[PDB]
Amino acid sequence: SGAIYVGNYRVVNRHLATHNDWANLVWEDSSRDLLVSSTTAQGCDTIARCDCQTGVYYCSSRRKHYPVSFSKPSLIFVEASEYYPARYQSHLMLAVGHSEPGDCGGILRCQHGVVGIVSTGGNGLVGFADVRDLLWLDEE
Numbered sequence: 052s053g054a055i056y057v058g059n060y061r062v063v064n065r066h067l068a069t070h071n072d073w074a075n076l077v078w079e080d081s082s083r084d085l086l087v088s089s090t091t092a093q094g095c096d097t098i099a100r101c102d103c104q105t106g107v108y109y110c111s112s113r114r115k116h117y118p119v120s121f122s123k124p125s126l127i128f129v130e131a132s133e134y135y136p137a138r139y140q141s142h143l144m145l146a147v148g149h150s151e152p153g154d155c156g157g158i159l160r161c162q163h164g165v166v167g168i169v170s171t172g173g174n175g176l177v178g179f180a181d182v183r184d185l186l187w188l189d190e191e
C-alpha cells in the first residue's frame with residue numbers, strides 16, 4: 052500500500068483505489084495502474100520532472116529502501132499477479148529488486164522528487180508506474 056500526496060491530489064495504484072477515491076476521482080488509467088483523487092489537506096510530496104534512471108524505492112515486504120537503476124517508461128508485458136491478469140502495462144519502469152503485491156504504492160524517488168510508485172513484481176524485478184509525465188499534478 053501507499054500513495055503520493057502532491058498538492059490536493061492523492062496518487063494511488065488503480066487496483067488499490069478506495070470507494071472514496073472513485074467518488075472524488077480526478078483521473079484514472081487501467082493500462083498504467085494509476086488513479087488520482089482529490090484531497091482536503093495539501094500533501095508533502097514533490098514530483099520529479101526529469102529522465103533519471105537511478106533512484107531509491109521503498110519495499111514494505113523488507114521494511115527497507117533500496118537504491119536501484121530502472122528502465123525509462125515503457126509498454127511492458129507483465130505476468131499474472133494476485134491483482135491483475137497477464138497483460139501489457141504502459142508507462143512502466145523495471146528494476147532488479149524485490150516486489151510482492153502488498154509492496155504496491157511504495158515510492159521510487161530520485162534527486163528531483165517522486166518518480167513513481169511500485170506497481171508490479173515477481174521474477175526478481177520491481178516495476179514502477181511513472182508519474183513524471185503527469186505535469187498537471189503540479190498545479191490546480
Ligand SMILES: C[C@]1(NC(=O)C2CC2)CCS(=O)(=O)C1
Pocket residue numbers: 124125126127140141142143
Ligand atoms: C511513449 C511510449 N511508447 C513507446 O515507447 C513505444 C510505442 C510503444 C508509450 C507510453 S510508454 O509506455 O510510456 C512508452
Ligand SMILES: [Zn+2]
Pocket residue numbers: 099100101102103161162163164
Ligand atoms: Zn530525477
